[PDB]
Coordinates of all heavy atoms in Angstrom, one line a residue:
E235 N 10.1 -10.5 1.5 CA 11.5 -10.1 1.2 C 11.8 -10.6 -0.2 O 12.5 -9.9 -0.9 CB 12.4 -10.7 2.2 CG 12.2 -10.4 3.6 CD 13.3 -11.1 4.5 OE1 14.3 -10.5 4.6 OE2 13.0 -12.2 4.9
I236 N 11.5 -11.8 -0.5 CA 11.6 -12.3 -1.9 C 11.0 -11.4 -3.0 O 11.7 -11.0 -3.9 CB 11.1 -13.8 -2.0 CG1 11.9 -14.7 -1.0 CG2 11.2 -14.3 -3.4 CD1 11.3 -16.1 -0.9
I237 N 9.7 -11.0 -2.7 CA 8.9 -10.2 -3.6 C 9.5 -8.7 -3.7 O 9.5 -8.2 -4.8 CB 7.5 -10.1 -3.1 CG1 6.7 -11.4 -3.4 CG2 6.7 -8.9 -3.6 CD1 5.3 -11.5 -2.7
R238 N 10.0 -8.2 -2.6 CA 10.5 -6.8 -2.6 C 11.8 -6.7 -3.3 O 12.1 -5.7 -3.9 CB 10.5 -6.3 -1.1 CG 11.2 -4.9 -1.1 CD 10.9 -4.3 0.3 NE 11.5 -3.0 0.5 CZ 12.6 -2.6 1.1 NH1 13.4 -3.5 1.6 NH2 12.9 -1.3 1.1
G239 N 12.6 -7.8 -3.2 CA 13.9 -8.0 -4.0 C 15.0 -7.2 -3.5 O 16.1 -7.3 -4.1
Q240 N 14.9 -6.3 -2.5 CA 16.0 -5.5 -2.0 C 17.1 -6.3 -1.4 O 16.7 -7.2 -0.6 CB 15.4 -4.5 -1.0 CG 16.4 -3.5 -0.4 CD 16.8 -2.4 -1.4 OE1 18.0 -1.9 -1.4 NE2 15.9 -2.0 -2.3
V241 N 18.3 -6.2 -1.8 CA 19.4 -7.0 -1.3 C 20.3 -6.2 -0.3 O 20.9 -5.2 -0.8 CB 20.2 -7.6 -2.5 CG1 21.3 -8.5 -1.9 CG2 19.4 -8.4 -3.4
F242 N 20.4 -6.6 0.9 CA 21.3 -6.0 1.9 C 22.6 -6.9 2.1 O 22.5 -8.0 2.4 CB 20.6 -5.8 3.2 CG 21.5 -5.3 4.3 CD1 21.8 -4.0 4.5 CD2 22.0 -6.3 5.3 CE1 22.7 -3.6 5.6 CE2 22.9 -5.9 6.3 CZ 23.2 -4.5 6.5
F243 N 23.7 -6.3 2.0 CA 25.0 -7.0 2.3 C 25.4 -6.9 3.7 O 25.7 -5.8 4.2 CB 26.0 -6.7 1.3 CG 25.8 -7.4 -0.1 CD1 25.0 -6.7 -1.0 CD2 26.3 -8.6 -0.3 CE1 24.7 -7.4 -2.2 CE2 26.0 -9.3 -1.5 CZ 25.2 -8.6 -2.5
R244 N 25.4 -8.0 4.4 CA 25.8 -8.0 5.8 C 27.3 -8.1 6.1 O 27.7 -7.8 7.2 CB 25.0 -9.2 6.5 CG 25.3 -10.6 5.9 CD 24.3 -11.6 6.4 NE 23.0 -11.6 5.6 CZ 21.9 -12.2 5.9 NH1 21.8 -12.9 7.0 NH2 20.9 -12.1 5.0
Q245 N 28.0 -8.6 5.1 CA 29.5 -8.7 5.1 C 30.1 -7.8 4.0 O 29.4 -7.4 3.0 CB 29.9 -10.2 4.7 CG 29.4 -11.3 5.6 CD 30.4 -11.5 6.7 OE1 31.6 -11.5 6.6 NE2 29.8 -11.8 7.9
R246 N 31.4 -7.5 4.1 CA 32.1 -6.8 3.1 C 32.1 -7.7 1.9 O 32.7 -8.7 1.9 CB 33.5 -6.5 3.7 CG 34.5 -6.2 2.6 CD 34.2 -4.9 2.0 NE 34.7 -4.8 0.6 CZ 34.8 -3.7 -0.1 NH1 34.4 -2.5 0.5 NH2 35.3 -3.8 -1.3
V247 N 31.5 -7.2 0.8 CA 31.5 -7.9 -0.5 C 31.9 -6.9 -1.6 O 31.4 -5.8 -1.5 CB 30.1 -8.6 -0.8 CG1 30.2 -9.3 -2.2 CG2 29.7 -9.6 0.3
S248 N 32.7 -7.3 -2.5 CA 33.2 -6.4 -3.5 C 32.1 -5.9 -4.4 O 31.0 -6.6 -4.6 CB 34.2 -7.1 -4.4 OG 33.7 -8.1 -5.2
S249 N 32.3 -4.7 -4.9 CA 31.3 -4.0 -5.8 C 30.9 -4.9 -7.0 O 29.7 -4.9 -7.4 CB 31.9 -2.7 -6.3 OG 32.1 -1.8 -5.1
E250 N 31.8 -5.6 -7.5 CA 31.5 -6.5 -8.7 C 30.7 -7.7 -8.3 O 29.8 -8.1 -9.1 CB 32.8 -6.9 -9.4 CG 33.2 -5.9 -10.4 CD 34.5 -6.1 -11.0 OE1 35.2 -7.1 -10.6 OE2 35.0 -5.3 -11.8
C251 N 31.0 -8.3 -7.2 CA 30.2 -9.4 -6.7 C 28.7 -9.0 -6.3 O 27.8 -9.7 -6.6 CB 30.9 -10.1 -5.5 SG 30.1 -11.7 -4.9
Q252 N 28.6 -7.8 -5.7 CA 27.3 -7.3 -5.4 C 26.5 -7.1 -6.6 O 25.3 -7.4 -6.7 CB 27.5 -5.9 -4.6 CG 27.9 -6.1 -3.2 CD 27.6 -4.9 -2.3 OE1 26.7 -4.1 -2.6 NE2 28.4 -4.7 -1.3
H253 N 27.1 -6.5 -7.7 CA 26.5 -6.3 -9.0 C 26.0 -7.6 -9.6 O 24.8 -7.7 -9.9 CB 27.5 -5.6 -9.9 CG 26.9 -5.3 -11.3 ND1 26.9 -6.3 -12.3 CD2 26.4 -4.2 -11.9 CE1 26.4 -5.8 -13.4 NE2 26.0 -4.5 -13.2
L254 N 26.9 -8.6 -9.7 CA 26.5 -9.9 -10.2 C 25.3 -10.5 -9.4 O 24.3 -10.9 -10.0 CB 27.6 -10.9 -10.2 CG 27.4 -12.3 -10.8 CD1 26.7 -12.2 -12.2 CD2 28.6 -13.2 -10.9
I255 N 25.4 -10.4 -8.1 CA 24.3 -11.0 -7.2 C 23.0 -10.3 -7.5 O 22.0 -11.0 -7.6 CB 24.7 -10.9 -5.8 CG1 25.9 -11.9 -5.5 CG2 23.5 -11.2 -4.9 CD1 26.4 -11.7 -4.1
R256 N 23.0 -9.0 -7.5 CA 21.8 -8.2 -7.7 C 21.2 -8.4 -9.1 O 19.9 -8.4 -9.3 CB 22.0 -6.7 -7.5 CG 22.2 -6.4 -6.0 CD 22.2 -4.8 -5.8 NE 22.0 -4.6 -4.3 CZ 23.0 -4.4 -3.5 NH1 24.3 -4.4 -3.9 NH2 22.8 -4.1 -2.2
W257 N 22.1 -8.6 -10.1 CA 21.7 -9.0 -11.5 C 20.9 -10.3 -11.5 O 19.8 -10.4 -12.0 CB 22.9 -9.0 -12.4 CG 22.5 -8.9 -13.9 CD1 21.3 -8.6 -14.4 CD2 23.4 -9.0 -14.9 NE1 21.4 -8.6 -15.8 CE2 22.7 -8.9 -16.2 CE3 24.8 -9.3 -15.1 CZ2 23.2 -8.9 -17.4 CZ3 25.4 -9.4 -16.4 CH2 24.6 -9.2 -17.5
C258 N 21.5 -11.4 -10.9 CA 20.8 -12.7 -10.8 C 19.5 -12.6 -10.1 O 18.6 -13.4 -10.4 CB 21.7 -13.7 -10.1 SG 23.2 -14.1 -11.0
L259 N 19.4 -11.6 -9.2 CA 18.2 -11.4 -8.3 C 17.3 -10.3 -8.7 O 16.5 -9.8 -8.0 CB 18.7 -11.2 -6.9 CG 19.4 -12.3 -6.1 CD1 19.7 -12.0 -4.7 CD2 18.6 -13.6 -6.2
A260 N 17.4 -9.9 -10.0 CA 16.4 -9.0 -10.6 C 15.0 -9.6 -10.5 O 14.7 -10.7 -10.8 CB 16.8 -8.9 -12.1
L261 N 14.1 -8.7 -10.1 CA 12.7 -9.1 -10.0 C 12.1 -9.6 -11.3 O 11.4 -10.6 -11.3 CB 11.9 -7.9 -9.5 CG 12.1 -7.5 -8.0 CD1 11.2 -6.4 -7.6 CD2 12.0 -8.6 -7.0
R262 N 12.2 -8.9 -12.4 CA 11.8 -9.3 -13.6 C 12.7 -10.4 -14.2 O 13.9 -10.2 -14.4 CB 11.6 -8.2 -14.7 CG 10.4 -7.3 -14.5 CD 9.8 -6.8 -15.8 NE 10.7 -5.8 -16.4 CZ 10.7 -5.5 -17.7 NH1 9.8 -6.0 -18.5 NH2 11.5 -4.5 -18.1
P263 N 12.2 -11.7 -14.4 CA 13.0 -12.8 -14.9 C 13.8 -12.4 -16.1 O 14.9 -12.8 -16.2 CB 11.9 -13.8 -15.2 CG 10.7 -13.4 -14.4 CD 10.8 -12.0 -14.2
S264 N 13.1 -11.7 -17.1 CA 13.7 -11.3 -18.3 C 14.9 -10.3 -18.1 O 15.7 -10.1 -19.1 CB 12.6 -10.6 -19.2 OG 11.5 -10.1 -18.4
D265 N 15.0 -9.7 -17.0 CA 16.2 -8.8 -16.6 C 17.3 -9.5 -16.0 O 18.4 -9.0 -15.8 CB 15.8 -7.7 -15.6 CG 15.0 -6.6 -16.3 OD1 15.1 -6.3 -17.5 OD2 14.3 -5.9 -15.5
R266 N 17.2 -10.8 -15.8 CA 18.2 -11.7 -15.3 C 19.3 -12.0 -16.3 O 19.0 -12.1 -17.5 CB 17.6 -13.0 -14.7 CG 17.1 -12.8 -13.3 CD 16.3 -13.9 -12.7 NE 15.2 -13.3 -12.0 CZ 14.0 -13.9 -11.7 NH1 13.9 -15.2 -12.0 NH2 13.1 -13.2 -11.0
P267 N 20.6 -12.2 -15.9 CA 21.6 -12.6 -16.8 C 21.4 -13.9 -17.4 O 20.8 -14.8 -16.8 CB 22.9 -12.5 -16.0 CG 22.4 -12.7 -14.6 CD 21.1 -12.1 -14.5
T268 N 21.9 -14.2 -18.6 CA 21.9 -15.5 -19.2 C 23.1 -16.2 -18.5 O 24.0 -15.5 -17.9 CB 22.2 -15.6 -20.7 OG1 23.4 -14.8 -21.0 CG2 21.1 -15.0 -21.5
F269 N 23.2 -17.5 -18.6 CA 24.4 -18.2 -18.1 C 25.7 -17.7 -18.7 O 26.7 -17.5 -18.0 CB 24.3 -19.7 -18.3 CG 23.4 -20.4 -17.3 CD1 22.0 -20.4 -17.5 CD2 23.9 -20.9 -16.1 CE1 21.2 -21.0 -16.5 CE2 23.1 -21.5 -15.2 CZ 21.7 -21.5 -15.4
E270 N 25.7 -17.3 -20.0 CA 26.8 -16.8 -20.7 C 27.1 -15.4 -20.1 O 28.3 -15.2 -19.8 CB 26.5 -16.6 -22.2 CG 27.7 -16.0 -23.0 CD 27.4 -15.9 -24.5 OE1 26.2 -16.2 -24.9 OE2 28.3 -15.4 -25.3
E271 N 26.2 -14.6 -19.9 CA 26.4 -13.2 -19.3 C 27.0 -13.3 -17.9 O 27.8 -12.4 -17.5 CB 25.1 -12.4 -19.2 CG 24.7 -11.7 -20.6 CD 23.3 -11.2 -20.6 OE1 22.5 -11.9 -20.0 OE2 23.0 -10.2 -21.3
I272 N 26.6 -14.3 -17.1 CA 27.2 -14.6 -15.8 C 28.7 -14.9 -15.9 O 29.5 -14.3 -15.2 CB 26.4 -15.7 -15.0 CG1 25.0 -15.3 -14.7 CG2 27.2 -16.1 -13.8 CD1 24.1 -16.5 -14.0
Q273 N 29.0 -15.8 -16.7 CA 30.4 -16.3 -16.8 C 31.3 -15.3 -17.6 O 32.6 -15.4 -17.5 CB 30.5 -17.7 -17.4 CG 29.9 -18.8 -16.6 CD 30.1 -20.2 -17.2 OE1 29.5 -20.6 -18.1 NE2 30.9 -21.0 -16.5
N274 N 30.8 -14.4 -18.3 CA 31.4 -13.2 -18.9 C 31.6 -12.1 -17.9 O 32.2 -11.1 -18.2 CB 30.8 -12.8 -20.2 CG 31.0 -13.7 -21.4 OD1 32.0 -14.4 -21.4 ND2 30.1 -13.7 -22.4
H275 N 30.8 -12.1 -16.8 CA 30.8 -11.0 -15.9 C 32.2 -10.8 -15.3 O 33.0 -11.8 -15.1 CB 29.9 -11.3 -14.7 CG 29.6 -10.1 -13.8 ND1 30.6 -9.7 -12.9 CD2 28.6 -9.2 -13.8 CE1 30.1 -8.6 -12.3 NE2 28.9 -8.3 -12.8

């Protein structure tokens, strides 16, 4: 599941939170947000 990287939301979560979470959980490390990009999200 870790390797496949697909994220399923089991609870109602806002579109923006889902986006942030999926961004942090990008398979390619280089596609992940910087700390700055996270706090500017």
Side-chain angles (χ1 to χ4, degrees):
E235 303 181 85
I236 298 172
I237 283 168
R238 176 167 183 257
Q240 181 75 211
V241 184
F242 171 85
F243 285 88
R244 56 193 86 189
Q245 299 274 317
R246 163 66 208 193
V247 182
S248 69
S249 293
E250 273 167 4
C251 188
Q252 284 197 27
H253 178 278
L254 184 49
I255 289 170
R256 286 192 168 92
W257 199 11
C258 295
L259 295 183
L261 289 186
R262 284 212 290 161
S264 31
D265 283 337
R266 279 168 219 161
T268 52
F269 284 84
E270 179 181 5
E271 281 164 330
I272 294 173
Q273 295 185 287
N274 283 334
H275 190 283

